From Swiss-Prot, chains A, B, C, D:
Pfam families, sorted: Sod_Fe_C (PF02777), Sod_Fe_N (PF00081)
Cofactor(s) for this UniProt protein: Mn(2+)
Name of the protein: Superoxide dismutase [Mn], mitochondrial
Top-level taxon of the source organism: Eukaryota
Compartments where located: Mitochondrion matrix
SUPFAM superfamilies recorded: Fe,Mn superoxide dismutase (SOD), C-terminal domain, Fe,Mn superoxide dismutase (SOD), N-terminal domain
PTM sites of type N6-acetyllysine: 45, 52, 91, 99, 107, 179
GO cellular component, one term: mitochondrion
EC number: 1.15.1.1
Family annotation (InterPro entries): Fe/Mn_Superoxide_Dismutase, Mn/Fe_SOD, Mn/Fe_SOD_BS, Mn/Fe_SOD_C, Mn/Fe_SOD_N, Mn/Fe_SOD_N_sf, SOD_C_sf
Organism: Homo sapiens (Human)
Keyword Oxidoreductase attached: yes
Matches recorded under PANTHER family: SUPEROXIDE DISMUTASE 2, SUPEROXIDE DISMUTASE [MN], MITOCHONDRIAL
Summary of subunit composition and partner proteins: Homotetramer.
Length: 199, 199, 199, 199
């Protein structure tokens, strides 16, 4: 059982003019493809170390497993969080939960925008669901550290603030990239993930 | 006494075709200018906290002080480490030290290249001088963490592997950026820093 | 500003038999005294570095500032959170808040106990108040990293799980130390800190 | 692979009066036993996660794997580095190497002592061999982070500065524990590890 690079659920230029085709093609066919391959390489090395009981090799492989493994997790969710049919505001119970936990939808965007723009270096901004507390929660993750594996929160919406995700189009003005991405957020997908957390 | 953005010792397009003018202009006039301003803002906030004895505010300001403060340190050295008159190999005692500590100049480039390309996320690759041991030493730093402040090593040559330092020209192929930058390394400046470490 | 070691609100043997007198004496007159002394020395160096604009020295002093500065913050709160007249359960809105956010007082004890016992190495277990969300929140901190300075949460009740806090009496059985400390929790002080969080 | 708690090469009271019998008994039968048991449980979970491709579970298990896995590595080496027939100074090439890399045996003790006493919180002080550079090197590790797995250096002599390693006897005065441990250093074992580093 090996991990595979999931196909993009839309054309490279489907999110224009918010995210140009050059960024989408590089972000998926180059960056994500490398994470999957490196992930499969690390898993095979880790399996050999675990069979031999080489705990030293297991720990030496952790940085490569979390970075590439997290990259495969984060980017796989990122594509579904975007869509040419996205934008606007969510509906149903998710919208009610955003108003209840953050006050309003605009306030929520402000909190997630501040968490995303506040990331110093490479990282991610996430809207997650706290299963224990039963409400929403915003958190930032450094580098490719996945949300659930490092915080326990269930990812609902992630914003890649790696420079490779916007620099070609927005250069150093990360806020401009954060303002535009809200227009293509696939709230239908984010709603499916939210409803799955409640039973 | 406030920190200031040092002027670039050459034209934006002096390092072409290795580093295009668009990268140099953005890297200096936008990224570095922000580090200096944010650094001065943080120092003033830290001074107020220190006068009031507010240790909580001091610690809350550490991430902003190390990132912007380190950025001002790293980029100020980075410009002098490059030059249109650079490239080739160093001479004198520095070349002898590289051969003695790393075997050869090509081996040194291999070690610093591996440290630079091995940085997962944002960071820096550095050639430093270990004053205690009296020899050279290669080390990688995450994000803008400066070399001397976090390792004690005296910086001699730094390679910015932040994506903003090469993505516009080399995209995700960081190795291509590392291969080209060796042609514009200002070994005259790196020699001055090395000779200053010995007395 | 010259920080000072606060006088203990009680004699070293007031919390027996839950925390013996030898631990209290060492924890206050040796461990806490060292943080204050080292903190004052570090603050003086930070003042000298700021006057000279030595950013390298500032970053090099951060670990000592956070450890000793956080130690002064944490232990100063720890003494007030304990009392010979403590124990039992809180009353009023704090008890209602514990029931609301954690289900019941017993469930809250189980969650904070797991967080304190879960600390690998040295650290602290904290019950804090999230002013932005307006409810309670449990969090663990590594080493002496203070709660508010590193997380923003306002400390209400802290449990020192440094080995020096229980080893002399409970040895490696940290769970026994967690069970015994509930008998001396000064809920009057925790309520004061909880009321200070509200308008 | 089912890791096992290694038998001690001596009785618990063989290293008296430098390390009393109560510490040795607790450190081996309680502290080290917990790392092995928790390590075996964590490895089993890692095998289950790998078979299912659950990368989230793999990353969530890393802290427990590094702490307990590193604990098994460090303590297993620590017992062999000590002996009732130890003490004094090394001989042969190891002594020459200590003189070459650190000037003298006394200066080496001062450097490794400062590194061990300098650990803030829990950690380890290590004398290691850098195979790439072919000389000795001193390094400190936080918590149970093993030397080779996190730094690449081959461990030669380790000093446990976890509070549980000395507090019962020396209380908060860690320097006294560092001075006393030199009397039981098994330089015969350290030489074997140093000779294994060379062809
Ligand atoms: Mn990305
Ligand atoms: Mn840069
Ligand atoms: Mn303490
Ligand atoms: Mn130990």
């Amino acid at each position: 059982m090996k991990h595979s690079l999931p196909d993009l659920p839309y054309d490279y230029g489907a999110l224009e003019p918010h995210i140009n085709a050059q960024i989408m093609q590089l972000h998926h066919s180059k960056h994500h493809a490398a994470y999957v391959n490196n992930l499969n390489v690390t898993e095979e090395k880790y399996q050999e170390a675990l069979a031999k009981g080489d705990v030293t090799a297991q720990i030496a492989l952790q940085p490569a497993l979390k970075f590439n493994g997290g990259g495969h997790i984060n980017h796989s969710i990122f594509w579904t969080n975007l869509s040419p049919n996205g934008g606007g505001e969510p509906k149903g119970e998710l919208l009610e939960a955003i108003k209840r936990d953050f006050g309003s939808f605009d306030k929520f965007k402000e909190k997630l925008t501040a968490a995303s723009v506040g990331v110093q270096g490479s990282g991610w901004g996430w809207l997650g669901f706290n299963k224990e507390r039963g409400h929403l929660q915003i958190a930032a993750c450094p580098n490719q550290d996945p949300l659930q594996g490092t915080t326990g929160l269930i990812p609902l919406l992630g914003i890649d603030v790696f420079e490779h995700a916007y620099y070609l189009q927005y250069k150093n003005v990360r806020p401009d990239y954060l303002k535009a991405i809200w227009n293509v957020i696939n709230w239908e997908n984010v709603t499916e993930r939210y409803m799955a957390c409640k039973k």
